[PDB]
Amino acid sequence: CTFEYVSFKNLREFVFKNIDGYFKIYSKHTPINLVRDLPQGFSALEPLVDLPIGINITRFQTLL
């Protein structure tokens, strides 16, 4: 508990990385036509969050 913070037609995209104790989240939300694979085309993700976590990460799991 050494840190705490607060703030298929749609595709939600994210990027997560941990560098020098900072955890960076980027994202994009976009409409799509075909859901079976990621849509061929281009649109860059933009930063949301940049947490000073200081924690080691080697595994992750999604929450449904």
């Binding site: 020098d20 104790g21 200081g54 080691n56």
Partner: peptide, 22 residues
Amino acid sequence: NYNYLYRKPFERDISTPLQSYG
């Protein structure tokens, strides 16, 4: 003093292994 002790950039690790300072 038993209140103070020691064992990547800005990493922290509270896992355990520790020596208190005298």
